[PDB]
Design an enzyme around this catalytic site. Structure first.
Site, PDB file in Angstrom:
ATOM      1  N   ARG A 156       0.852  -1.176   0.000  1.00 45.05           N
ATOM      2  CA  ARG A 156       0.000   0.000   0.000  1.00 45.05           C
ATOM      3  C   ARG A 156       0.888   1.225   0.000  1.00 45.05           C
ATOM      4  NH1 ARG A 156      -2.085   2.659   4.587  1.00 45.05           N
ATOM      5  NH2 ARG A 156      -3.679   4.250   4.165  1.00 45.05           N
ATOM      6  N   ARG A 173     -10.872  21.088   7.168  1.00 44.57           N
ATOM      7  CA  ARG A 173      -9.779  21.435   8.064  1.00 44.57           C
ATOM      8  C   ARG A 173      -9.934  22.830   8.626  1.00 44.57           C
ATOM      9  NH1 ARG A 173      -4.106  19.412   5.274  1.00 44.57           N
ATOM     10  NH2 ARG A 173      -4.407  17.167   5.671  1.00 44.57           N
ATOM     11  N   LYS A 226     -13.480   3.480   0.646  1.00 42.45           N
ATOM     12  CA  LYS A 226     -13.073   3.384   2.052  1.00 42.45           C
ATOM     13  C   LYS A 226     -14.186   3.420   3.121  1.00 42.45           C
ATOM     14  CE  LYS A 226      -8.829   4.793   3.658  1.00 42.45           C
ATOM     15  NZ  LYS A 226      -7.973   5.957   4.069  1.00 42.45           N
ATOM     16  N   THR A 264      -6.635  -0.518   9.507  1.00 47.44           N
ATOM     17  CA  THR A 264      -6.358   0.397  10.622  1.00 47.44           C
ATOM     18  C   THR A 264      -6.487  -0.280  11.985  1.00 47.44           C
ATOM     19  OG1 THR A 264      -8.555   1.388  11.080  1.00 47.44           O
ATOM     20  CG2 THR A 264      -7.338   2.254   9.172  1.00 47.44           C
TER      21      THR A 264
END
Ligand SMILES: C/C(=N\NC(=O)c1cc(Br)ccc1O)c1nc2ccccc2[nH]1
Lengths: 583, 583, 583
Positions: free
Chosen positions: A32, A73, A219, A277
């Site tokens: 990855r 953000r 995802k 994860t």
């Protein structure tokens, strides 16, 4: 016997040719590359290192590119650091401003239109959570009650628990990033923050311009994603389940029910799924994982995951090899102790029953019931390998493919060990090559059973649509079989009746010319009988049938040809006799 | 709807009357008292606090006493702290000595006879692991190669990976401690470091002296324990699975396979099992658990656990209430999303098929198939509640019991909500009380179905051996049923044919005196029909039968009595008519 | 073990008190009176003879009355006999005329309206078949091509292959005949030529005037009947399948498919079905039936028939007893060799799954799996006996009923052996009586298992709704059971260790006071152990548990009380010890 695949994240602690070898040996199946960080330069460097080491070791390892995706953000903060009282208010401004405990700005200037009064707003991976008090579009501000307290750095992230987040499918950078991937024949694109089918098709339309043929794995990191899981897979090649990213937006009490459901929803459609994860995060600092982490991984495997990802463990961690070794070990252990009869029965109910799946079902059952050593699945595209994989059989799936690149795509699907053999046109060719490819992998040898499967003719192949059950060669002797049975036993060639007198246990197949009266007392005490010449109502035939001992008469020079003491399997139906163990 | 039970460990952060209330409200079912620490005084204090708060809230909470058990420990060390080089040697002395990097003593003076050359010896919860090099009983010393390095405090623990550890079943303190438990009518004894049946019987013989009636739950913390699981449960009331204690002696790669197996082995025998330790350990410092921990808990539930334990989370943690609230939430989520059809089918294969279990099976199936709201299980001892529980039905199990103390024992078993109602002798009494007890819990009301089950006659009851399916009352009107069907629909009482003309959807059950020619066109457009008086070949009966509309004729004053517009269920077989929804 | 019920037709060769006894002994369960012939006088005579002989033998035999029904017939013929050429024409006249090869009259003057051009018309049980050529209502005549040739007597029958034959449901005689039946409390009415539900309701409305309570069994003899089978059973108590009568109207190539279907359609609804006519017709002249007939009967039983009828065989035949004896024998043989596991599995799929049937299902399974000797079904009406019967369990069904007359109605339903015991109000009473009634039938004794089932409370009973599994008494000794197992074995009471030394096979349960070191070597060689006094960790308990031998300690005076050598069953769970074989 290896089954669940391992994705690894490449980075500083695993760039080296030296380490990538150690990782591939440790069991890496897909590398990855995380485009959330690093320059195109850096990644190209690692793509070369990988390919070259991969081919030097003569192993198939795919390359997965993970887009950074869109994001919200905070703009910069006054003094760089700022604090928020636990019962206070903060105004979240769409117009850019310097940070303060009151006014405070975000990059997603359209945030105000997605939230409403009472919507939560999480800052810096949920470090401190706000909640929308009033909304005045007048000043384009969102007044918010600061619920938990804490600090706030500059360019830190923001999340809106769904809430249809109205970002685009892909950044302009993401476009730049996936074009780079097209240029390097990368195998997988893991698209971040996917939440509608639109967001995947935005990638696939870039791929279709180039006629790229890269698999797209969304995802799923938020409620909208979860909610649209069926519609997304309709339009996707596989799926990644990012628990950590997901955990920020939805309660961690609820995540493992969602993981279990998404993985199951992927199994339903034969689409591969990666669990990602927070896997072995403790191995970034320690040379062995914790019980909690082992359990966590093992449960992903039990949920039905095709592959299992490592992030910092391999990318920046102090122990990259040990993480991959330890991952494989959990994987092997967990599969070792699982019931493939339940597993099949489960899938047989779970996946649809259709023309398209008819041969996955039959193969799976046949494989379980007859204890077939390997299923060899001939594919151009991979769809046959995936079809066989989704029914989860004990048997190793071998994917024989002419395409080097649809072989790297097989490296991620569950239980498939792909090999690249050169294209056969006719069915006959395909079958024969299959049997030969299987033997040359070293997994199958002479006794073993094999199911060969593919879509034929290889041309009009859309779906997989035939299977052959094949015994891997190749009768050492044969004749006229009497009875219908079979046994494995060790031979004892007899020239005389006294050539088997004071030296006989049972457990042996006797080999003489013909049977006298002097032989009949000894034949009953034996396991099987191979007589040289004779007919169906010969003395040798009639004593084998009457005593229920599987025999073969009419065997060319059996006394001279077939060896003494060497172990043998006789098949009374067929009238064949085999080297070692058979079926 | 609550199902998997919650044990909590009481300590400094949860002694208060104030907090114990908050815990019971949070969903505590069993309080655990850990006798590894604290004086008898302290525990008695907490036992009072609990009982009193428990009865003030009118809730059944059991008290579990967890013995410290035997253990091996290091004697004191020179300077209190000592160090061990990573390739060196250390002599483990059976005779007491001051600590040093060479000589070094243990309390279990019989260690030398359980180990052999090459046996591992773990110090201080596996912090640093030794390995036996030579054994000379001459000096009664064990020379050991120090494998991993680290420090060593004074009275720190030692573990011998099995290795039949030859400690006794219980300390002298453990005897003292379990006698205290007998004196306080404590409900459960969790016996530590159990590894043979002998070790359980040592407790049960103390209990039989007092004719105590406390349930004994062994802890299983080592290989010998795992190996003897069947023989131990034969002699035990339930089981605790302590992962952390277990993790020290066996590889954490291997623990979750063992957990899954022990839990399954308990399910097989209807014995309750608690999954313990390392559950939500992060909530000792944080107000919310991590994804990993949620997954971990949820998976215990899926493995088939009856109960789930909290340790420091509730005992010494900063967030005891939030731990219990968060535990229930995971529990509810995890169960919410699980397939009770699979679950039953699973248990039906898993548990033995016997006279003793015959009614667990039938109840479970009946309950699933007919969608019964509640199973009310009448027990003296609990064995009927356990028998019904082991087959894991969706339906709430209500345990009606005369014994207050065999109602606290039900508080731990899966899916059982116990209530104390006063002993009925005759079967009729038991059935009627059952139905009344169910209604008074508020869970079942008038439409609902119920299965009543118990062992009868209540005297010779060994096993559970009868079931009754009961509809919770109580036909509002009735008559002569025509047809065999049924429907739920809202009433429309009609005095005239025009009393249902320009105001008719379907979805309604019409109620008139009798049917004319003028009524027949409207009856076909309806859901059901209740006519006042008539016979079986009346115009009202013949039109209901011909048009496939379930009807009841011969209903006393139906026009005046049964109300207009109120929703109703008619059962054509039976000839009964019900208040709201029925079955 | 007797299962399929036998109906017999009474007539000249079976009127006598002497013969009816021989028939009831031969196995008659229902006597049929055929009202197609004979006066009311004659039948009343036979009804008395039956009742009296029936009660003298103390056996339940029902009385079935078979109506003649409507019919079409030829009026008289010129010279009494007339002939019809095989390619000719005949006019079938609605107006009465003398017979001729041309003109020719029928009693059903409405025939012309039911047929059309090309409809077939069968004369004298299909002896010669016509076919409608032209129809002129002008002269009210039907011109017909005479297809097959033959003769034609006077008052001979006519049939119209369906064709909605538009006769009424019942003759005026049939009304007269069924009123006679109401007067004599006859148990069954077999209604002829039924084809619509109307035709049954015409009888049931006569019955409801008298509040009669007789079961109505339609005969189904034509296509309209077959077609309306579901709608008819909706309105009927059972069904008769008259193959011979049916054979006249529909091709005999097609009859056995229809038999198989109707019988199955009756099994679906728990309605009893009788297979009638052409059964053992050869026994009217011969003392033994033919292979073809045996096969024919046996196949009715396999199709799922409740009962099997005899006509001339018993009514006018030379061998009435031998016919009934031979019928039972086929019945027993055919059932002997049939798989009740398949049979249950079949019905479990076939019959609906509902609240009403929930306890038929569970009882059937429980009965098969645990091998219960008898199912005792408490009924007022019979509906519980029928519910249990429809799931076809190996176990004998015993119908305990207060109603003498709903006991005669049970005499026809499959596998039910009814007995009349006096009404118990409370459930406890019902259960206890059940167990007592079962034992007194002689079928169940002390080892045996029993399922008691009924609708409770006996008042509001609509449906059957509870079951109890009961072991038929009654532990001879008991104590503290160690282990959970059980074994049947013969006792060997031991006072000394030498009281079992040189005289021991295994296969025996030893009975001593307590176990020494001198006893332990012998206990391992045994089947079971009953020690006198002791606790759970006694030497006697610990050796039984360790050696896997089911034992019971703490048994009052076991040495003196329980006998030597007598065979015994010990149940380690329960801690009970039983007389002979148990469960
Ligand atoms: C399958 C079933 N019951 N099964 C048993 O009671 C049983 C007992 C033993 Br001993 C062994 C196996 C068994 O299946 C059932 N009961 C129902 C009631 C209502 C609706 C549907 C139902 N399905």
């Amino acid at each position: 016997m290896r089954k669940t695949k391992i994705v690894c994240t490449i980075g500083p602690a695993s760039e080296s040719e030296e380490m990538i070898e150690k990782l591939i040996n440790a069991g890496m199946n897909v590398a990855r590359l995380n485009f959330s960080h690093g320059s195109h330069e850096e990644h190209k460097g690692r793509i070369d290192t990988i390919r070259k080491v991969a081919k030097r070791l003569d192993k198939i390892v795919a390359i997965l590119l993970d887009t950074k995706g869109p994001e919200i953000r905070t703009h910069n903060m006054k003094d760089g650091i700022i604090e928020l009282e636990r019962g206070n208010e903060v105004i979240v401004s769409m117009n850019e401003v310097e940070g303060t405990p009151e006014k405070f700005s975000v990059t997603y200037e359209n945030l105000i239109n997605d939230v409403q009064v009472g919507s939560y707003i999480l800052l810096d991976d949920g470090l401190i959570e706000l909640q929308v008090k009033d909304i005045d579009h007048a000043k384009k501000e969102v007044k918010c009650d600061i619920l938990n307290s804490g600090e706030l750095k500059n360019k830190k992230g923001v999340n809106l628990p769904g809430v249809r987040v109205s970002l685009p499918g892909i950044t302009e950078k993401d476009a730049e990033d996936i074009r780079f991937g097209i240029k390097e024949n990368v195998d997988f694109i893991a698209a971040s923050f996917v939440r509608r089918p639109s967001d995947v098709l935005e990638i696939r339309e870039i791929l279709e311009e180039q006629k790229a043929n890269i698999s797209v794995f969304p995802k799923i990191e938020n409620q909208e994603g979860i909610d649209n899981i069926e519609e997304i897979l309709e339009v996707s090649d596989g799926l990644m389940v990012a628990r950590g990213d997901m955990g920020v937006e939805i309660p961690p009490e609820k995540v493992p029910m969602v993981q279990k459901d998404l993985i199951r929803q992927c199994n339903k459609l034969g689409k591969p799924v990666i669990t990602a994860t927070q896997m072995l995060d403790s191995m970034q600092r320690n040379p062995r994982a914790t019980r909690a982490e082992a359990s966590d991984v093992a449960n992903a495997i039990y949920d039905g995951t095709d592959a299992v990802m490592l992030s910092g463990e391999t990318a920046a961690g102090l122990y990259p090899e040990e993480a991959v070794k330890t991952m494989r070990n959990i994987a092997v252990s967990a599969e070792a102790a699982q019931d493939y009869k339940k597993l099949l029965s489960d899938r047989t109910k779970l996946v649809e029953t259709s023309l398209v799946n008819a041969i996955g079902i039959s193969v799976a059952h046949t494989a379980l019931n007859l204890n077939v050593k390997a299923i060899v699945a001939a594919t151009e595209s991979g769809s046959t390998a995936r079809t066989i994989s989704k029914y989860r059989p004990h048997s190793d799936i071998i994917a024989v493919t002419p395409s080097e690149e649809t072989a790297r795509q097989c490296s991620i699907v569950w239980g498939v060990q792909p090999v690249v053999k050169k294209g056969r046109k006719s069915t006959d060719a395909l079958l024969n090559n299959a049997v030969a490819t299987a033997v040359e992998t070293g997994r199958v040898t002479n006794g073993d059973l094999i199911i060969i499967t593919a879509g034929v003719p290889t041309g009009e192949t859309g779906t997989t649509n035939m299977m052959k059950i094949h015994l891997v060669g190749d009768e050492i002797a044969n004749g006229q079989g009497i009875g219908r049975g079979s046994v494995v036993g060790t031979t004892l060639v007899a020239e005389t009746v006294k050539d088997l007198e004071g030296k006989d246990l049972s457990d042996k197949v006797i080999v003489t010319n013909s049977i006298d009266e002097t032989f009949v007392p000894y034949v009953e005490k034996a396991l099987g009988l191979i007589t040289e010449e004779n007919g169906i109502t010969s003395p040798s035939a009639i004593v084998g049938l009457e005593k229920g001992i599987p025999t073969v008469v009419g065997v060319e020079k059996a006394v001279k040809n077939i060896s003494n003491n060497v172990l043998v399997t006789i098949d009374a139906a067929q009238g064949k006799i085999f080297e070692g163990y058979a079926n």
